Assembly symmetry: D2
Homo-oligomer: 324 residues x 4
Amino acid sequence: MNGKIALEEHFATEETLMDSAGFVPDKDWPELRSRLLDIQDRRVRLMDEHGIETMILSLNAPAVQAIADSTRANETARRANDFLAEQVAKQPTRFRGFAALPMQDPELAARELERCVKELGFVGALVNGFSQDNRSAVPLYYDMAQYWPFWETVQALDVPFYLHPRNPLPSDARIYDGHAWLLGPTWAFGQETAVHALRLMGSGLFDKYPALKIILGHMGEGLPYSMWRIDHRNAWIKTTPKYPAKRKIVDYFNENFYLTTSGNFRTQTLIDAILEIGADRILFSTDWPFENIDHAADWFENTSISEADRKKIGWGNAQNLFKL
Amino acid sequence: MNGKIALEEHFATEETLMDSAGFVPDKDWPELRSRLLDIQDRRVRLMDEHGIETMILSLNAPAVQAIADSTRANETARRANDFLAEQVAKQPTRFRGFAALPMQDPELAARELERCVKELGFVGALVNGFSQDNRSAVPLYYDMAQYWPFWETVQALDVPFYLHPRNPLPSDARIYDGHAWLLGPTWAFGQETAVHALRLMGSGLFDKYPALKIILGHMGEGLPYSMWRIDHRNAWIKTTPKYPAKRKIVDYFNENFYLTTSGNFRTQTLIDAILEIGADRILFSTDWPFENIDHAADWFENTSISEADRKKIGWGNAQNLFKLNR
Amino acid sequence: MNGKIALEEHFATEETLMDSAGFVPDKDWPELRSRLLDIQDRRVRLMDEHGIETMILSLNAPAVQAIADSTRANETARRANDFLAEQVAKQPTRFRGFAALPMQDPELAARELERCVKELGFVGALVNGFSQDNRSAVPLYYDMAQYWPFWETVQALDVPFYLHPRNPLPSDARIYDGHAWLLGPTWAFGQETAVHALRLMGSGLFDKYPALKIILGHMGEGLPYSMWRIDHRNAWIKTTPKYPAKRKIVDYFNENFYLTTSGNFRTQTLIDAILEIGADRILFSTDWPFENIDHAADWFENTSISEADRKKIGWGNAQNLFKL
Amino acid sequence: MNGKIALEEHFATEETLMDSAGFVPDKDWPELRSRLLDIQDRRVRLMDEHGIETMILSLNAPAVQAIADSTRANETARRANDFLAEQVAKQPTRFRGFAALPMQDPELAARELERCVKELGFVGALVNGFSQDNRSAVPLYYDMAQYWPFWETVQALDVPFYLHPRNPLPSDARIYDGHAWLLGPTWAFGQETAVHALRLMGSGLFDKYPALKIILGHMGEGLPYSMWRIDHRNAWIKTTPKYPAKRKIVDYFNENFYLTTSGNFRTQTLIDAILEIGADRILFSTDWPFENIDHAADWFENTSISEADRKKIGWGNAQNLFKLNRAENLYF
Ligand SMILES: [Cl-]
């Protein structure tokens, strides 16, 4: 299938490159590093070879979310975005950009998102989970009141926010002590991102801003499988849920979320996602260069869904979402 | 469908009762309290009305896992087991017991499991996640080396170990700060239990003791949906996984684990579990009294699976697993 | 779920009433007969109680298709259609009509479809499989060349054609001799209708008129389950299929067909249809009065699909299809 | 996955070879002919290359079912069965046999099945739909009363009966006239076989012999998708079904039938069958030489099911069904 749109497709700048070093064995780092820095050449050949018309590009991880000085975070985000705009402009029919944002300061993040969308033609934002900030004794999650004016801005711009993983901070990760193999994509990323996403939903953010669109990778970080249980556990109790939001969590999941297939090339899981959220809210993605383009495309080509849905997931849904 | 076997079915003693307080709103505590304390009477009428032949009973939560003096944990486990055995004996065709165990101390736990299996006729153990023990600065997880001789006894006895949830300790729960709605069955129970189970799998425990049987409630706490990703993430990398176990995580999930339907009455979730672990390793359970028997039974009666698999999940699998036809 | 649209919903006129007698046991005939005749009263109360906003009504079976004199068939069709228009006009927000057509004569059927659509505001046609005609020694199936100008007319009007069952003729039903329990909805209706549809697909009709929309009840009469096998059996043989159509049978199935849930209230069956043709092509229907509205609605309310797709199958798909 | 058991795997003798002609284009006949006649050599190499330990072999189609003189049918069945026994004995760890049977004559069919099971060590029978017999004005279907003593014998022997397709007779095939492309595996085989199987269930045969085991290829010829509808259509009517059987059709489908994956290598269809009849009653098979071994094995290797069910469908179910891990098959 030609014409696919892929939207969790990463690069690094020299400035952020080393953030990705921890995530593969030392012998595989030169390969991963070269993939991260390459945008124009091998990446596009592989797109050609595997039926991808367009990659929506985003910076690597944790990148800006780990830059604890908010002034420095803004400066880095702005440099990464200008670079990305220049890269996109070289092959404008094959690429779009997601913004890197300095979420350390809601106001700076809002301004940078406006610049990115209206000046640079970017089609959304991608943010690696909570932010570290020297002014805050705690990690910053985006359900917090200070972020409401930022979300108002997102909704006004009508572009999606892709909530990407990062690892929990060490003091929030003791369950994984002595078990580092569970950190990262194996498991810890999924738990961190699912809970951050649930925090947004429980906060009532989508009551106030009901047109917001949040994207999750990895087929939604386990959420569809346990979604029924999230609202319906202990159903014999008749009570008002103890979160600020007005409706059930699944209503927000159904109305405000999109899932991508990145790094989760499993037909059973896709079928479960289809039967919980619908093929209209599922988008093809690879997670290149952390996952191979060939693996992602070959799996997707042959997965056990209708051809009508393969088209929607392949490109139709993304076409509509990003007004492409 | 009559003849069902259910095996995540809880009671409290007056001693452990307060552990369940504040899992429900105040207005509902009189009802939960009465359910937890009733074994002989209304519980059996509900079983009769909803086609459950046998409930395998277990103490509530965290119960023994929160008794930080190991000597007292053992004393409590022993009293609760003796009580359970007495209650089982009043209606022996309708009940079996799971052991409560003082996991604070591996030798005490192994000895108590032996007594429960050999002297009391118990058919497995149920433990509410990690243990607190005054002697340990850190919570105790059962992948730790000190537990290996205990697991040797589990395998020798050839009875399953049900790994039930508890909440993370507050200092390991900062992600939920300001969001207490996420603690308990909503989410936190699932994460804590999935990770504890994965820690057992990655530790190599099942290489050393391959015949062990571990049971998880709640359709495996999310595990089936993300199981492919656990082993296969970043597949382009050819490397040996950085855990001590010798095989893939999914090999031990497939070979050593069973899932029950407790508190997760969702047909899509069941189908996904069937397509990942197979109907032979899925067991009906309810999580009474925290979930209604009528809700669990009515959902299961009509869920979209073959009748052959309805019989296996309803009773066939448990009959084989627990040797009840034997 | 309020606002459902249901589109295999039957009535009889006194003229066609007895065609339905003997589909149910004698003790049940008085009930069925009263249901068939009632359009305005109990039927609407039941729609209210079971969340159906609109029923697209069609005549019973075999009706016009068993009237062998083509002139008589056209007279009966006109009366039934005029009656239906008068009935729809009494409660115009709750009903629409499908045309009955004298398929015995392709020109008369085209003209009657035109009159029904243009003058009566009907939104499609419903036909009970093959037609009997005195002038023809064989039953008339609609893939035959004489039907092509009719199909040109259907396409130009841009309204769907609902291919409903009837039983095979006795000389074409010997396999059921001594086994009358297999006739009708049990099995024979499904075989008869699947093959009629497949004849349409293989004939090349949809090469010539690619915008045609055909609707099948009963979740597609077994088609999705065996659809892969229809094209891909004996795949090691590299050859051109021996039918006149230019593409695979499944291409026409995917592009030209819709399925309804009528009389097949089975979640496993619906999931298989979703994974083969996609939820965009599946439509809620009951087969009232042959099946109960309460059974149909209760099953569909709780079936194991996404809320997005429940809305699409419930009403969204029909709204789009019929331009309501 | 090595170790698979496949049980819809065909051969021809020179006697029955021409029955398979005109199933494929002329250009492909030399290949199909060579596959049908080869049992010992390339067939085993392809089994080795695609992870099949055992093929349970059966004659091609319609073969015995089209021999209308019952005396001649019995003669052909005997010769075909002796040939198969001799062939199996050459490589007894890789092959088992299904009986070809002269179903024209209930008595002859029962005696030949006895001979095949007791003397030749065959593990079931495979019959290609209805029989033509000169004495009968109508095609012979196995729900008919005269077959009940034959089925008593099947149950007593406790071996399965694989009901394979054949086309309807032309006079029963007018719906396909001018549409020959629908004949055969495309569609007509499936309709024919589904109905024949339904006639057995409706007849009450399984009330009388409840231990019978019937096998269907092609994932059960459409039956699972439409099984709910078979019993439950028009449910508001409270009535006794108008067939002689005492129970619901689905009760017999669930209790007396097995389905194989032959010629239906479709994951959506497998999942549907799993959720209707259960993986315990599904068996890997290929339909070699009419389907490729490699296509069947490659699809099954990667289909979206549990590893536990992949072992059951791949070999476990068949190993148990045909008692292949048992003394009479291993040592005698
Ligand atoms: Cl009829």
